[model samples]
Target chain A: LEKFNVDLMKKAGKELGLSLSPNEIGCTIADLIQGQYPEIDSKLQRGDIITKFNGDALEGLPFQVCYALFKGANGKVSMEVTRPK
Target chain B: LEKFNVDLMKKAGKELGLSLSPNEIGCTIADLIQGQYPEIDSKLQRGDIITKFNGDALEGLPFQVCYALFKGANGKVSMEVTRPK
Candidate 1:
């Protein structure tokens, strides 16, 4: 598993015009920080459930822990998400 | 940022029934191991260009580095991909 980094987490959020919260949003897909990405803004919705990270299920994990999956310095995060619909 | 782990990398592939090879596939989206995922199997294709991982661009990077993005133990990988249109 990869180690999570706070700075990187914040950066990833910055690049995508959003920030994540395990608390503020509580178990949901966290809100998009009033921003955009050509591919993502249209592809994802604020309420989409992030079903998996890397390759692990995020079912009952704390929001903080789940949010940590995006803690990468790779300039991007790879994940599998499911729409709430 | 997250630290890449080879074991986790292999495990992710195992769950998805696929393995990634930066060398074997070069910069293209590697082949799927005749797998099945309700959400993924139909979302991605062999030749699609994985434009971003998390929120970073994948252009110009070596295949190994790009593959490393999936190096997580999260059971599900999240990525931004663009199919060849």
Candidate 2:
């Protein structure tokens, strides 16, 4: 999947060191820049489905909304994702 | 101000070790349990006006909505607050 290139998404990707793409469930973690952010890498993995951004549910929202949520995030972003079994 | 006693709010208070009450801007940080969560205490202060919960702006929102937002928060809650200057 192509990485979202919107400025907001790009900024979030840079801060998070993760590439994301919209999918059915939500945004899928497409790739991770290894060692860029060890805390992020430890919690998230490629292919994880991000179902929630902060406390807001992402299901059924457009990708733009999801991207905006990521962009608007301030200190200590919280995400709820589902990992592959 | 009476501390919110709803189960969800109570649970959140227990985890966060903070006493919150609704105010004009949003929720006010009424008290903090010192030494309970150094990270939280370091970032927040008593009498701060919490203007945002996670990425959702809380201005003009009712206390219930704001309370629910705080209750629904999971892992690493992010808040935007204004402190007395």
Candidate 3:
């Protein structure tokens, strides 16, 4: 039997405004702390309330780490931040 | 000059216990809301509180949103959840 369906992709595309390809939502940044954070993942807890990446406020990011990729690893990007309180 | 070194990768690996690969922490689950969520990203809302996936307690997972990938997407997996209160 030969059958083809647009069932899943169509449904997924309907979910996002436009078809959100895999690449669009890929790449995130997570820190690596010693261990057991207790509250939140200890790694991220080390960062301050506000930070900067490439001079743009990290807090001003649209989607936390997701949007952080706007500036990238391959590019000349930088991260500046206030130390943990 | 032709040279190579184990600088960044070694430092990162030393920080992350086992060598954390690109594939290790990828493929997260998200929801798409109609508009602004206020709490988190809206488009990725509409789920629930302490939901269930594949008959396991989504809350009981070692990491929220993560570890959920123990089950495969290509296989039959189910999700049960308590909606936002």
Candidate 4:
């Protein structure tokens, strides 16, 4: 696990044009900035539960830890998501 | 990350009937003990790249760390896997 850095994660989220909130299962997509990173927008949607990010499981981890993981993401992020059935 | 304990992981793997090897990306299912855990065998195959194990990203982590994470897993393991296209 990376160091817990909230500011860097917030900045990364802002730059990436997405916001997240912690739910019972994992992190959920809270919002996506309009016309930002279309690549991210194409794969993710609001209310989607991010089960894995870049091959890392996000479930049961603290929100700060999840943010730290997201902050370290580079090109071609891979995510495993869950949507309400 | 959990404490790095190779013995525990090895024991768990033996009990679970699976073997893993670390590659450039993450841990790969090197072998699965025959008729040990059909539940695991049902979802995972030899050569499958495990990106996430129980919500923790295994990529870029040392083999021991991955083992430690696996050792900590309990019931209902969730894995995010990548299979060759």
Ranking by DockQ: 2, 4, 3, 1
Q: Give the TM-score of each candidate.
A: 0.36, 0.43, 0.26, 0.39
The per-residue C-alpha lDDT of model 1 at residue A47 equals 57
CAPRI-style class, candidate 3: incorrect
Most accurate candidate by TM-score: 2
The digit string of per-residue lDDT tens for model 3 on B43-66 reads: 122223324445554444454243
Candidate 4 lDDT over A42-80, as tens digits, reads: 565677776766556667663444343454354555666
**With candidate 2 superimposed using the best TM-score fit, by how many Å does residue A67's alpha carbon deviate from the native?**
3.2
lDDT by residue (tens digit), candidate 4, B1-85: 1121111122344477667776666677788777656556456677877677665677655343433345445556666777754
**Tens digit per residue, CA lDDT, model 1, A1-85:** 1222111122432444333434332233444533335545546655555555555567666655643455453544545555444
Whole-model lDDT, candidate 3? 0.27
In terms of lDDT, the poorest run of 10 residues in model 1 chain B is B1-10
User: Tens digits of per-residue lDDT for model 3 on A2-69?
Assistant: 11111111111121111111122232233433332222232233222224433344443355454333
Whole-structure CA lDDT of model 1: 0.45
lDDT of 4 at B83: 75
Q: Spell out the clash pairs found in candidate 2.
A: none
True interface contacts retained by model 4 = 0.00
For model 4, the stretches where C-alpha displacement exceeds 4 angstroms are A1-85, B1-14
Q: All models: lDDT?
A: 0.45, 0.58, 0.27, 0.57
Residue A1 CA displacement from its true place in model 4, Å: 24
Runs of candidate 3 exceeding 4 Å displacement: A1-85, B1-30, B33-47, B64-71
